[PDB]
């Protein structure tokens, strides 16, 4: 499951993040982002490579209409994959 | 139990040679296990046997509690999403470019959005340090870059066990130095077990944790890294230290020097 | 006898290869009749075996018709019958040489080079890694090639007979002084449709089932070292060449018995 | 034009291979006509290309004669002339199919597998180490093979026509009810010696010069990796098969013009 | 002058690549010289060039004062009795037995009595420790025994220079341990110079005396054994010690991470 | 040159020993050995492998009609090749 919520200005996410549950959340890419400024990483249990890339896409097109999105709640598995694929600052700042 | 792979008592013999009598090995989770033997007897033999290409004649092989040569055709197809291999020559489809090769099994095992699929395979070429070779045909790959591209093809469906069919042979110490650096991270990050099977003592010992020396058909003198560095058995002293003549003969069995050179 | 035990190994060995040839092909054409994937996959294979094999057929097809029109011209003139040339090379091509020679050259170009691509694909373990991809290659890489043969060779024969019979209409009519309206005229009422024209296809389409199967089997059980693969290529040409004549003598007995 | 420069590379490239084919063969047959070494060396090569190619010729030779005796039997009966069968299959074999089909199968078995042994011998550098032995291989390994061809194929044709014409004498005489003394009788005064019997050899011996040369050249300039060598084998079969029909149309013009 | 081999200034280029600009090397008598590299950039190239297979486009090559690509056809044939080679795969004629292969060039270059010729080639199989493999066809040779048989074939006409076209690749440390033991005696006994050309640092340094590292097209940083062990140049530290990334890049030249994964 | 002499009971040898000069001395194998007991190694400059083997044959058939031949005058190049081909005692004693 990839249930997700909003606060009106901040996108929430819950459930697990796999490469088999992410396709309906790809269908929401313009009503999903609403001038978002933060991303919770609240109830993630596993992160996958494409689910990281889906995470990487949502922050990126949250530019040019919205805010510079802050990050929090990371379970320190994504930071392992961060320097692994040596992702730059301007696509993923913390 | 953390033991991913465990074969109980395998008895092979193609029919004339009788390789693999009374073999036994355990592969636990989080490890970098290592298998080393004479040279050319187990390498492609055991790895296709452990993969479910060749059926044994005795014993039982576990992958988290399931017997491997007893599954269905469909069920053993499904467990192939877990484990993958990496061949000694590098198995690349020649009639493609290197982008479509590494992005191949994503189109065969999952449904992905097209700009999303294109991006997530592009970053994984950076994960092996091979993003720049993006749209090359697998002919101009100079050998060294050929193995790394199949390695990025190996980590596709988040594999939990990656069989290394002799990654280290015939290559430069800079290229051997690259491959030990990549394979060190991929067990530390991502928690992937890997079964390296080769014969290159000053490189495999820098990464292994529990080696298994397959000298004869038996699994004689297996252990950890520094334990096998001090075992004074004549087989393992000859193999790891490269002694010119021990129990392994220097010469060939022949006649006397009285009728061969005096006819 | 000590030497009769060396034959006892062979009489079991040479029959198990026939068991492998049926068992490989039976797995190749059963289950999942998918057409979304194969329809662009197959049409790339017809560029391999159809288009590259097209040029050798037509440039050899003009030489057979020019020879039979030349050599046949002496045999008719000694029996003093000019008009029979049109019902000779039409007769000889459409029932004897059309199915037999075109299948020979198809075993030559497309028969051998298909076997090279199979055994090489196991030699670099592109086959053995595709099982780790959990895709069954016999429906995936063999059946696009196998249907690429049996569709091709009937369309390789009808191009052969036509350009063969056109070159026959050159050297007799134009160069060796025969009226053009007389040549086709004896050819018009020469051959029927029911036991001649479709009969050319029956001889040709049953050759394509054998040659494509005998080619793609030898790639599947060849020794993957570089020595055994070229041995298998020259084993494919010699085995198809017996099977085309081992069938044609049977298939000329039923139609004309 | 931008595309006409891609042809400018080829028009120079494809002519330099013809320069290599003459220059290799000219060095192969000049200087030191030694016979003490070559006479056991050559006779091992005739076991390679003569004895192993013998079985495929005779088992295919009986099928051609049985087909022409079967198919020819319908064409004579519609023109009501029984005795012409003996002067038909003797005629057709000894001047048309004898030189053309036997050279095809010889390009099949012996034409290809000779090229495999050459390119493999450069692939493991047995060629490149023989220069360190200071023995020139073109007189040493090529000329034992080249003479092994042109001596063989005339003796491969005369075995082909004979077993071909014997099978033709089965199905017409024995099975399809013709007197035995009548069949050879029309064949006795059928063909002469001066423009028929030696003429079969002239068509056959000029084929052996081409097929053996076109086979052993492709082994000498093939890419020594395992991919390029099997490419060269299926380039040898397709190039000989045009050259046998590219010559036969010329060599049927002179004899019957 | 004891310098057997000396090429002055060789300038190659097949036509598109320009390998070998400004190369220079001296090989003296009694030595075991050693040439390294990065990974396939000289190995079969230089050795056929030094043998008189491939002619250079510049420079002069000496073998006791004679220019190599200026001799006659007959005269350069005569000097081939001096020097010999040993290929990476082992060049054995397949349609023979291993006796006739090692006894081959004696029948091509000298006249010997038949029982005498049979005996003197039998003892030389003992000299490589391969007397027992006496009448085997070169198919059942298991690789390791294949190189040693061509080595006994190499010492036939008492050669004074034996080129080793990568003897050490893809083999077992016992088999590598055999080959360093044999090649040590054949320079000590018989005074034979040998030009080993490979890339295997912990084996070639145990026998060499004056190495020549051919990193780029130049012959940069050549010297003795312990001198090149302390040279802190970034090329020779990366190569001999197997540093993962120095001047030789880790990754490939590519674009930025802004348009490749963000389409 | 491979000039050689006798003392009536001991074979002498002079000149060089190569693989190209040894064939006439192979033709003398029964008039050459005359119950020989010693071999000088007097004026040898180079020894070859077959010339060693020719030396090895002459001592060997000097058995079964003659003496056990003593050896002397070796220039210590043959002793290098002795243990190289690991020649036994009964074919070459010193
Ligand atoms: N049915 C068979 N299939 C494959 N090889 C077989 C078979 N029967 C016998 N063999 C022999 O056993 C060997 C099996 O291949 P092998 O495992 O040696 O490949 P490899 O990758 O070279 O392994 P290594 O590097 O350890 O030698 C082959 O060399 C072959 O000669
Ligand atoms: N005319 C040519 N002959 C041979 N190789 C050529 C030629 N032109 C270009 N090349 C290329 O240059 C290379 C020459 O062979 P190379 O010296 O690499 O063999 P090698 O034994 O692999 O040596 P190394 O170990 O240094 O690669 C070949 O890989 C080939 O692709």
Residue numbers in the entry:
A (entry chain F), F (entry chain C): 4 to 97
B (entry chain E), E (entry chain B): 5 to 267
C (entry chain D), D (entry chain A): 3 to 259
Can you quote the paper on this entry?
The IM MlaFEDB complex functions as an ABC transporter to translocate phospholipids between the IM and periplasm. This complex is composed of four components, namely the NBD protein MlaF, the TMD protein MlaE, the phospholipid-binding protein MlaD, and the auxiliary protein MlaB. MlaFEDB is assembled in a stoichiometry of 2:2:6:2 (MlaF:MlaE:MlaD:MlaB). MlaD forms a hexameric disc-shaped ring on top of MlaE, with a central pore lined by hydrophobic residues and has been shown to contain phospholipids.
For cryo-EM studies, the purified MlaFEDB complex with the E170Q mutation (MlaFEQEDB) was incubated with 2 mM ATP-Mg2+ prior to the preparation of cryo-EM specimen. Image processing generated cryo-EM maps of the MlaFEQEDB complex in different conformations (EQtall and EQclose) at resolutions of 4.3 and 3.7 Å, respectively. In contrast, the ATP-binding sites in EQtall structure are more open, suggesting that the two MlaF subunits do not adopt an ATP-bound conformation with tightly dimerized NBDs. The structure of EQtall showed a major conformational rearrangement of MlaD. The hexametric ring of the MCE domain in MlaD is lifted, increasing the height of the entire complex (left). The ring of MCE domains also twisted clockwise, when viewed from the periplasmic side, by ~15°. The MlaE, MlaF and MlaB are essentially identical to those in the structure of nucleotide-free complex. The lift-up movement of MCE domain of MlaD leads to an extension of the central hydrophobic cavity formed by MlaE and MlaD to the periplasmic side, which may facilitate the movement of phospholipids to and/or from the periplasm. The density traces of a phospholipid tail was observed in the central cavity, suggesting the EQtall is in a transit state of lipid translocation. The structure of EQtall suggests that MlaD lift-up may facilitate the transport of the phospholipids bound inside the central cavity, which may help to move the bound phospholipids upwards to reach MlaD in the periplasm.
